[PDB]
Amino acid sequence: LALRDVAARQLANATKTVPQLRTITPRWLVRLLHWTPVEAGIYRVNQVKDAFVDYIDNPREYLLSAVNTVVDVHTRISDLYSNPHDQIREQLRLTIEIMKERQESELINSREYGLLNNVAPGQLVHTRNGAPTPDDLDELLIRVWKEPAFFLAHPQAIAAFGRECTRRGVPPATVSLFGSSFITWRGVPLIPSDKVPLENGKTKILLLRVGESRQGVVGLYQPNLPGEQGMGLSVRFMGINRKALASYLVSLYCSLAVLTDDALAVLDNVDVTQYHTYRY
Amino acid sequence: LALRDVAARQLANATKTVPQLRTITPRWLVRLLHWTPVEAGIYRVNQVKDAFVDYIDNPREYLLSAVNTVVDVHTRISDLYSNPHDQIREQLRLTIEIMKERQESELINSREYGLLNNVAPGQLVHTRNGAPTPDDLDELLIRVWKEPAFFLAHPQAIAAFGRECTRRGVPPATVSLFGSSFITWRGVPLIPSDKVPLENGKTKILLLRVGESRQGVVGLYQPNLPGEQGMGLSVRFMGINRKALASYLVSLYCSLAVLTDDALAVLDNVDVTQYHTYRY
Amino acid sequence: MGINRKALASYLVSLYCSLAVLTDDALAVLDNVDVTQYHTYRY
Questions:
Q1: Of A26, A230, A280, B117, which shows the fewest CB atoms inside 10 Å?
Q2: Which chains touch C (3 or more CB pairs under 8 A)?
């Protein structure tokens, strides 16, 4: 008999990871958008009227929106347990991750801005038979034929499109972006995002042109913020309350503008639950 | 509601102490002895016969004794759990502490060497009334009147002597040695040691002269050992067995010689259980 | 490890390893995969 493992383990330093947040996503849409700074929170998109040359007198003004989160950390927790990991920094990091996920979801789904609600008449396409076939994506590419950037879809919709391509004996090509592989259709990549709504096996697929040089989709943000930690993101210390809770304010200022109406098209009534039966 | 202490504690490094060994003692006797090296494990104490000048022809030869301890440490324990504390080093350190305690106990109590058994006739004093009074220590000082070094006693016997001194209205003086205070009697310090036997409230008190220049008590040790880590102490790696247990041999070589017989005296029948009743 | 009485030298080979799945959506398993099916091509 000798020294046991459980007793010798009382002398050993455990390697501790930072807390793993499983709802973190790559947030591809934010990385693929072009971001325009708005120095005073107002973006006015002037338009040619009925494209002599006249302009409309009531152009849409985009107001940047504010989302705030208060992060409360007890002073004794950050005082006592900040070795080897800063407790305040981990709380803030995680908080900002959750806020960035919410920001991507708002870029897709917001009622004021938000791609699925700012789609022009004539740019809304419907599937012929529910499932996202190659013909439906060809329709989408008809609607955004001027230099389309990427498709945006739920990963289940990308799988359904892959099944439809397999049934027709068509293997779609792939591209590498940001060290990851994506399906492409007619050279246009299919980008996954779990923020595209999926309810009762029904979802939507978006097609986007991005950039200000083109007349595409642009993201908007506020450029010079006190306590800035990122694009349109700021962190401020709010103070300490009577119960020794230190508070931090995390602010995110963002919006989205579709500069011209042929920069965005949406394929509606996409069914992701259809499976083919292969019989020979 | 905010982040709780129990959850935030999962990120914090705990400060781990080395294992505390409560049986560790200051081992004052070993620190107070003079240590003589014996290069080949044999110490022959020559004596003048019946002190012309003749020597005895059968002098006592002191053979250094060996105490061995095998320290088994599983290779996976030292491989896995040696951060930030070396597991083998802690096991060896603790093992050597226990062996040093045993060595002090053997210097006092051994049957071959050992002060309580190598006491000459005429140097054994008995208490007049059980309790260790000032008169009994004066008797001891009669027996070792030539430059006595220190008393050695159980801490309960030192307390009993203190009680006897208090009953007689005598406060004994104290000296500082090694950063610690000790009672002294007639300028001779009383050194505590829990290795002095105490059974049924009965113990002994020793008085020693030390050194080779004087003809006192000397400790003996072996000076040039393979794997030497201390005085007469060595550590050797023995090998690994089939079940991946690494073994280490800890060896301690020691003995003790009383050069002349008036260098040591023992006060016998010391009673440590007597308490005076103060009535006025 | 050392040499025994019959002049056999021993060596200890140790391997320390484990594996962690940090989040649960990092791993998926497809079960009941059948590898014995062959199609009959008739035209």
A1: A280
A2: A, B
